[PDB]
Amino acid sequence: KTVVVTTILESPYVMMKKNHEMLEGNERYEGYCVDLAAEIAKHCGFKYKLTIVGDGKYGARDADTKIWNGMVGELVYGKADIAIAPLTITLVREEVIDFSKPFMSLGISIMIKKGTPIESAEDLSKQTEIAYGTLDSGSTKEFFRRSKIAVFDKMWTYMRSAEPSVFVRTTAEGVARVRKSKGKYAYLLESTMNEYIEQRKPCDTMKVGGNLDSKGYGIATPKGSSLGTPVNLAVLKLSEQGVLDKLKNKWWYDKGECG
Ligand SMILES: CC(C)S(=O)(=O)NC[C@H](C)c1ccc(-c2ccc([C@@H](C)CNS(=O)(=O)C(C)C)cc2)cc1
Ligand SMILES: N[C@@H](Cn1cc(F)c(=O)[nH]c1=O)C(=O)O
């Protein structure tokens, strides 16, 4: 059968090709996870169709109805066979879907407009002049909402009460907000995205400080799927053959624009 892959528009993992109007099917998209999908499919021996998740969400569970949205929802309710995306491995997700060993490491990080007098989360937490926010749904938001760490708790308590809202609906919105706010907004986002943006014109943002946590993205399958095992073996093989490194370099650094 043709494997249905759910994924999400997020640079440089999955992007629309420049002439995507005149192209169709999987050929409409480019990026790290596009390449990774091709590799995994080659190693597991399956045909596949790339589909952009309907609600443009990563995956969150409603506290009241217990219903999952986003890519995770697509997996749990039988809409997709596999998610190949920068989907963070988390405990609550692992309880309802299966993850491969991780294919890329990351941690929550801080993005500033160059010139901003901020070097750490503690720095942010100690002041109010510079606003700061996260993506409105996903593992970063959850990290802050659930954290028992003093500094991070202080930051969450600030963020959920800030007027107007400091949360954004896409990474693009967060980056744009950094660039337009003349140093008065800092954006908390996954280090991988931060590092990508740092390598792109107009070269006016930077990652500062260490990461706030350490985790990974994994390939996800519906719980108890037969695809789970071969997909995991493929991730291991791609890791050991240096393919994951080659792809990371390909999409992040090989054509860097900021030196
Ligand atoms: C959710 C967490 C439990 S976690 O993210 O899974 N682990 C946390 C821990 C600090 C950690 C975080 C990230 C990494 C890490 C290390 C390597 C990789 C890639 C490059 C290869 N993954 S692999 O499994 O080692 C490989 C042999 C295929 C991806 C993630 C390893 C350990
Ligand atoms: N990977 C996350 C989604 N996600 C993406 C980002 F770019 C980010 O900065 N924060 C975040 O939670 C998830 O799987 O929920």
From Swiss-Prot:
Swiss-Prot/TrEMBL site (Crucial to convey clamshell closure to channel opening) positions: I118
UniProt family annotation: Belongs to the glutamate-gated ion channel (TC 1.A.10.1) family. GRIA2 subfamily.
Coiled-coil region: none
Function: Ionotropic glutamate receptor that functions as a ligand-gated cation channel, gated by L-glutamate and glutamatergic agonists such as alpha-amino-3-hydroxy-5-methyl-4-isoxazolepropionic acid (AMPA), quisqualic acid, and kainic acid. L-glutamate acts as an excitatory neurotransmitter at many synapses in the central nervous system and plays an important role in fast excitatory synaptic transmission.
Organism: Rattus norvegicus (Rat)
Induction remark: Down-regulated in the pyramidal cell layer of CA1 in the hippocampus by global ischemia.
Gene encoding the protein: Gria2
Protein name per UniProt: Glutamate receptor 2
UniProt comment concerning the protein's domains: The M4 transmembrane segment mediates tetramerization and is required for cell surface expression.
Localisation per UniProt entry: Cell membrane; Postsynaptic cell membrane; Postsynaptic density membrane
Posttranslational mods: Palmitoylated. Depalmitoylated upon L-glutamate stimulation.
Annotated site location: Interaction with the cone snail toxin Con-ikot-ikot: R61, R145, K237
Record note on quaternary structure: Homotetramer or heterotetramer of pore-forming glutamate receptor subunits. Tetramers may be formed by the dimerization of dimers. May interact with MPP4. Forms a ternary complex with GRIP1 and CSPG4. Interacts with ATAD1 in an ATP-dependent manner. ATAD1-catalyzed ATP hydrolysis disrupts binding to ATAD1 and to GRIP1 and leads to AMPAR complex disassembly. Interacts with GRIP2. Interacts with GRIP1. Interacts with NSF via its C-terminus. Interacts with CACNG2, PICK1 and GRIP2. Interacts with GRIA1 and SYNDIG1. Part of a complex containing GRIA2, NSF and NAPA and/or NAPB.
Extracellular-facing ranges: 117-259
Tissue expression notes: Detected in forebrain. Detected in dendrites of neuronal cells. Expressed in the pyramidal cell layers of CA1 and CA3 and in the granule cell layer of the dentate gyrus.
Residue sites binding L-glutamate per the record: P86, T88, R93, S139, T140, E190
Modified residues (Phosphoserine): S147, S181
Miscellaneous remark of the record: The postsynaptic actions of L-glutamate are mediated by a variety of receptors that are named according to their selective agonists. This receptor binds AMPA (quisqualate) > L-glutamate > kainate.
Disulfide feature: C203-C258
